[PDB]
Amino acid sequence: GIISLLDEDEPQLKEFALHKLNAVVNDFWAEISESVDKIEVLYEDEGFRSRQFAALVASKVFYHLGAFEESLNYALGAGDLFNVNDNSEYVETIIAKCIDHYTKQCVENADLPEGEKKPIDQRLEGIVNKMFQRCLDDHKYKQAIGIALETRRLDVFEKTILESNDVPGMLAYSLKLCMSLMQNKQFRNKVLRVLVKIYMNLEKPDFINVCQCLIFLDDPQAVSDILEKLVKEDNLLMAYQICFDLYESASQQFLSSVIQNLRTDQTLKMIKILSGEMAIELHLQF
Amino acid sequence: VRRAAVESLGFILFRTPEQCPSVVSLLSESYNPHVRYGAAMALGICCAGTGNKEAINLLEPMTNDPVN
Amino acid sequence: MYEQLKGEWNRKSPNLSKCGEELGRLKLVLLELNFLPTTGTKLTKQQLILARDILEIGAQWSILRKDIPSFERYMAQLKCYYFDYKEQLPESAYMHQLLGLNLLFLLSQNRVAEFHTELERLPAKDIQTNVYIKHPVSLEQYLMEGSYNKVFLAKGNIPAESYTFFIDILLDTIRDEIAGCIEKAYEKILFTEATRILFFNTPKKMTDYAKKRGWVLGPNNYYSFASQQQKPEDTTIPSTELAKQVIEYARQLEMIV
Amino acid sequence: LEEGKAGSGLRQYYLSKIEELQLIVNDKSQNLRRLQAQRNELNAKVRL
Amino acid sequence: DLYSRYKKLQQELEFLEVQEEYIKDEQKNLKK
Amino acid sequence: MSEKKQPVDEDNWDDDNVEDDFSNQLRAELEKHGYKMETS
Amino acid sequence: PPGGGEQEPPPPPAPQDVEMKEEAATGGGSTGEADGKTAAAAAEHSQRELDTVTLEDIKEHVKQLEKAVSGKEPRFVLRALRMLPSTSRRLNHYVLYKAVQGFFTSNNATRDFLLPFLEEPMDTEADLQFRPRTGKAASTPLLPEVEAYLQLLVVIFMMNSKRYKEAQKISDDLMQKISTQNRRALDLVAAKCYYYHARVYEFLDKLDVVRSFLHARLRTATLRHDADGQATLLNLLLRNYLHYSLYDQAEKLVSKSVFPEQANNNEWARYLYYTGRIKAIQLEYSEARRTMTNALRKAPQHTAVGFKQTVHKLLIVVELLLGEIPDRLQFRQPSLKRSLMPYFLLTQAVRTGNLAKFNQVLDQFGEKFQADGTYTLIIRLRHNVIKTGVRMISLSYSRISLADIAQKLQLDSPEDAEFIVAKAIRDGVIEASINHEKGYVQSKEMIDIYSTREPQLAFHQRISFCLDIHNMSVKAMRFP
């Protein structure tokens, strides 16, 4: 009956007509299903005062009809009036398809880096850092890091590991993830080398990092730098162990490449154990 | 070439040895011996040194085949 | 504020500026707060007493000027006020003829399926009393069986206000339908059959249906041509789609194992 | 609610998503072993 | 926790579709 | 199985087939059916 | 006490054993299929639901003193089942308290202490993983809580204890039901609560607040997916709006949710009853009377139940709105004797050309029409009082003059009898045509291409239906 108010042509009746739209849109579902063209009308005016609200209640009524992309495209035209509301079962279902549409978009965009990509909304990452604001309220950042792997975006992956200080081991746990369920190898090294950036920002180097990363990334100068660091702070305990692990794990021509970067004492110590002769005859001894 | 198909199963699935008895369960029960042969080696190279007892359950009619 | 509840109601309303004052009166009441929750509070029902009354007289002035999309607009908001969930509001003495205006309008524009489902909300007023509502439902009963002439002989008896702006449309949408029956293959008659069937001996209505319809008077003989089509047929037309149907027979026998 | 606001926000997204992913894996396993036994019949015919 | 469960249900679903496709071929093959 | 919509519910042994077709049309069948012949 | 007090020991004896082992086998077997074989539709879920409609409503209404159902509340007042020792210790509590209640008198709630004996079932370390156990064993004491029928201050205890359950119901929905999906049980739980919650809001103010809830409840159903959820909630949402005598039907005309797509032979039969009444009130008589016929012939498997006599009640009216009528009272009942006499005598006057009897029995039996909710026949069947004969004549005769149909319809006027025949052919009552040249009204042509062109347009559905039986057979075949 308030579509009769939508027929008349003054603005101060419109805003009290649309205020009554979303108030009873949950109970008077199919009445608006015929007045769809009137709203998508009222929407197309650039002189209309609440056109972004008309995209909200259109997204409400296509949500009833099951037209999910029509609620999606009008959530794009909704502005900040949509995402300022966040505690509903309505809002979480059509941002679910929004993440779903976006994460299948970037996998398609990862196939063609040379231009020819798509124009993209920016509230879809305005809810990402909002979810990070929830994770700031949560202390549990394992959930925002999940989409951060899925979204193929790595600066938010760096922002969430340069977060409010709670463990380096959480990042190590994320690194496991890269050993078990990581499928592609094209961006795997990028994830695997942005982990060793924050490791060089971190105070202690690990074992399983270079046991995973640098044999999958074959940088012989990088382990020759970080072990020279382990020489530099006089730490011959863990430099001694990672050479035996590297001699067991890695392959030919990479041990030959790193031993060139050695000479580029404890130096003659790591000549003999990266040649790895003494490990063989003690293994022959057993 | 049909053998080198069913022999290559262990090379791509040895990291998770649990799926290998489920997928070669009926590959061991074809009609030609060549598929059944590479099925037998696929149990040998997917599961490396496990005391599986499910693959061993599969190998017991495999060592009791008519074909040598 | 409280603008002319009986300002120009009783004697005459030739106004166009009080129509703008009524337009401003709509901008007053429907911008006060709202009418949606309606929990209790007879004091905030007091403007709901007046919001009914200004839309009643708004519907009075609408049929006084014959605006068709406006008359359904005011009546829907009036029907939305009898769609009140907490209806403690007392019986306005204009309700039965106001619904009779709606009952006659919605009969006139061929909403006959909407006619009978409208009659559910009337419990017992159709039988006991209420000739304002009893007259259009006796009218629709006259349209039921075969009785065209009892409609036009009850034309000279309306117990209500004049109802003329609806029943001119109501009978016009009757006349063209019988004209739609006679614009079929019923070939030729004289003016006296147009006097018997249609109505009216010697009025410019024979000029009306000479220009709207055909019906040229020849040598004291009208003319209406054949509206029958040729019916083009082949009857082997479904040869493609019958060949389609047998494909998904075997497609649903094989291929889905 | 440190966890309660987020169990509906960033965990209700996942656990509602894995629900239908659990249903279809449940569904195909009933469908697969049916296909298994139907193949074991025809192989028992041809080998005999 | 939950991200690892969602990845494994993605993997296992696309796994047994492939072994469903194998039995579709063999039952089609044994008819011939 | 209650469905919440059930709160109410040759003598004539095969009568309604006879009665729906013929009701009460002078069933002695002689006074008009056998007695047309006075007209001719 | 020497007469009835000595016949007090036999009541408890049995029902303390075999009625107790009902939910013991039900709660055990539902847990067994909730854990493994998580597609748990095929269990005693269905037969217990047929029992909770039939058996345990009439197995007990009162709590059956000397501790048969009176003991159920102090029995289940202490239910943790939390960890494996908390299961095995409660399994000892399943041994000890059933021995005490089988021997002596335990804590007898005096019909008002049932709600604090529904607190410690929800309390006392109760679980969320045993969500069938919480959902079933809370809703099953609500039927002694409602069918006590005293209806004084327990009505608000009805209102509290359902919203206790429905807060657990919604939280389980917003609780991620892993691999159980209680919706298969929670649908008729949402029905059985809202049958009497509709009664409560008939004994108090209106139940549009239920519909505002049930709109949101229908929203979270089938957006997840449908497992009987869209089917049950739609007939619940449709019933109030049909129960309200306001406008309410064009709301249902625009209700585009017309796919429950399966209903286990019980929701679909009553769903076709409601929408058959809807298409009858907007005067589409042909499609209405065939889906009313489909509703009557789909689920009649009862013993003189009454709603079968109600779908049989509305079906004869719309057939009198199109002329034909079969034998109706050939399945006469001790209660159908009340309801056969108006309608059989109604069509008695319709078939004859008598209207004075038709107006007399309206006046005689209008108050019975008030109980059936069918006032509208007098305004819309007086149409077919004149149209039944012209359907009967045009089926009998083949090429009739309009001068003779005037006396045969006893209208005594040929000039308007053209218009009655014109209206019937306008409405498609008879397919015949009129010769307006010398007064001929001839019928249709001979039997047409019916032997040649038609029958494949019946054969296509019967191919498609029978192979889908073959498809639904093969897909659901092998559980082992």
Tab-separated table of C-alpha atoms in Angstrom, chain G residues 3 189 261 290 391:
chain	number	residue	atom	x	y	z
G	3	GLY	CA	-11.630	-51.641	43.771
G	189	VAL	CA	9.072	-30.339	16.006
G	261	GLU	CA	9.449	-31.212	-4.666
G	290	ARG	CA	-8.574	-31.676	-10.491
G	391	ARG	CA	-24.764	-28.181	-20.006
